[PDB]
C-alpha cells in the first residue's frame, strides 16, 4: 500500500522516497498495476494508533 | 477521509509475468485438441500462435 | 482575469516538499519532471494562481 496522494510511484524507473527505499521496478518489467481507493479500512475521527 | 482528494491510500496488487522458457503450470481456459502432423495446421503451442 | 505573479529568488529550491504541502494528484508537467526537479539550477520561478 502507498499514500495514495500520488499513484505514479510504481513504474519502471522513477525516484521518490515512497519507492526508493521500499519497492523498485526493473527496466524490463512485463506486468500490470491495479490501484483503487480504500474507504472502509478504518473508521474513527481521531485516527488510529 | 475527513480530508480528501487522494488522502485515502491506494491498494496495489502488481502482478509479475515471467516469459516461459520452462514448464508453464498456468496457461488459460482453452482445453485441448487432437494432435495431427503433416498438414497445414494453425498452432497454439504453449501460447504463441503460428 | 487578475492572476497574481510573484517573483521568487535567493532561496532553497525544494520541490520534494510541495508534494505534501498541497493535497493534489500528480503533475501535468511539460518540459521537466517532478522526480528530478530538485537536481536542477535555473534563474527564476513564478507561481501564477487562480
Curated annotation (Swiss-Prot), chain A:
Domain of life: Viruses
Impact reported for residue 44 to T: In strain: Omicron/BQ.1.1
Region of interest: Integrin-binding motif: 3-5
Subunit-structure text: Binds to host ACE2. RBD also interacts with the N-linked glycan on 'Asn-90' of ACE2. Cleavage of S generates a polybasic C-terminal sequence on S1 that binds to host Neuropilin-1 (NRP1) and Neuropilin-2 (NRP2) receptors. Interacts with host integrin alpha-5/beta-1 (ITGA5:ITGB1) and with ACE2 in complex with integrin alpha-5/beta-1 (ITGA5:ITGB1). May interact via cytoplasmic c-terminus with M protein. May interact (via N-terminus) with host bilirubin and biliverdin, thereby preventing antibody binding to the SARS-CoV-2 spike NTD via an allosteric mechanism.
Task of the protein: Attaches the virion to the cell membrane by interacting with host receptor, initiating the infection. The major receptor is host ACE2. When S2/S2' has been cleaved, binding to the receptor triggers direct fusion at the cell membrane. When S2/S2' has not been cleaved, binding to the receptor results in internalization of the virus by endocytosis using host TFRC and GRM2 and leading to fusion of the virion membrane with the host endosomal membrane. Alternatively, may use NRP1/NRP2 and integrin as entry receptors.
Protein name: Spike protein S1
Species: Severe acute respiratory syndrome coronavirus 2 (2019-nCoV)
Lineage of source species: Viruses, Riboviria, Orthornavirae, Pisuviricota, Pisoniviricetes
Residues of the full protein shown: 401 to 449 of 1273
Amino acid at each position: 500500500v502507498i499514500r495514495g496522494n500520488e499513484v505514479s510511484q510504481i513504474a519502471p524507473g522513477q525516484t521518490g522516497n515512497i519507492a526508493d527505499y521500499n519497492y523498485k521496478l526493473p527496466d524490463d518489467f512485463t506486468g500490470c498495476v491495479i490501484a483503487w481507493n480504500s474507504n472502509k479500512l478504518d473508521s474513527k475521527p481521531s485516527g488510529n494508533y | 477521509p475527513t480530508y480528501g482528494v487522494g488522502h485515502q491510500p491506494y491498494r496495489v496488487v502488481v502482478l509479475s509475468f515471467e516469459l516461459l522458457h520452462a514448464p508453464a503450470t498456468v496457461c488459460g481456459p482453452k482445453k485441448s485438441t487432437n494432435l495431427v502432423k503433416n498438414k497445414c495446421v494453425n498452432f497454439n503451442f504453449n501460447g504463441l500462435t503460428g | 482575469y487578475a492572476w497574481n505573479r510573484k517573483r521568487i529568488s535567493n532561496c532553497v529550491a525544494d520541490y520534494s516538499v510541495i508534494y505534501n504541502f498541497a493535497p493534489f494528484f500528480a503533475f501535468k508537467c511539460y518540459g521537466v519532471s517532478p522526480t528530478k526537479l530538485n537536481d536542477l539550477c535555473f534563474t527564476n520561478v513564478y507561481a501564477d494562481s487562480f
